Amino acid sequence: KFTYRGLEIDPLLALSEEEFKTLVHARARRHMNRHANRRAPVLLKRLREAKKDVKAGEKPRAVKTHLRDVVITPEMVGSVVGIYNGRQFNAVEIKGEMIGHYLGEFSMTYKPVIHGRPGVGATHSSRFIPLK
RNA sequence: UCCUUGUUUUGCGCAAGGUGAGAUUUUGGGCAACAGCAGGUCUGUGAUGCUCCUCAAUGUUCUGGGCGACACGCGCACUACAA
Fold this sequence. Notes:
The chain is an alpha+beta fold. Helices cover 27% and strands 8% of the residues. It has a two-stranded antiparallel sheet with strand order 1-2. It binds one RNA strand through residues 66-68, 83-87, 109-115, 118, 121-125.
């Protein structure tokens, strides 16, 4: 199951570029129009390569990229993509509900913070907090 | 300036009134001595002493990605919006 707009997988695939960018949100539309002229020259190819070659019963071989300014189309669904937070290629597989998004959104770029006791200088009043 | 010849010592001026566009540093600025601080700035400059680094660089990198005064229990400064 998954409904993007009340469309299963096969309808989405069937859509040509025109019919596609009509259906998607405002950002995605704006993106595609402004771009033209490739602008994901390698990031299409590398996926569709390793995608095809699979014997199924398991995911494609992972591909790595730094880029995250590229959309998620119904073409690239099922693949295993790397996305780069500035020190780690991060593992994501592409679901049918990741259509209408970007890549970068699934790849965290910071550790969430959880604190560890405040030291001196926090509290204005002075006690010279032992021991942390 | 003028007058009150008030006040003041005849002096330096002062108070009230008059004249007038304007009445007392007319109103508001800019400039500003002598002696200093071991204040700040080597992130302004082909302003720099001595040191550090130099081809797998601390250089150049307008290269790809992240981070920056932004990441979140909490204290403080200034701002804005309200009851």
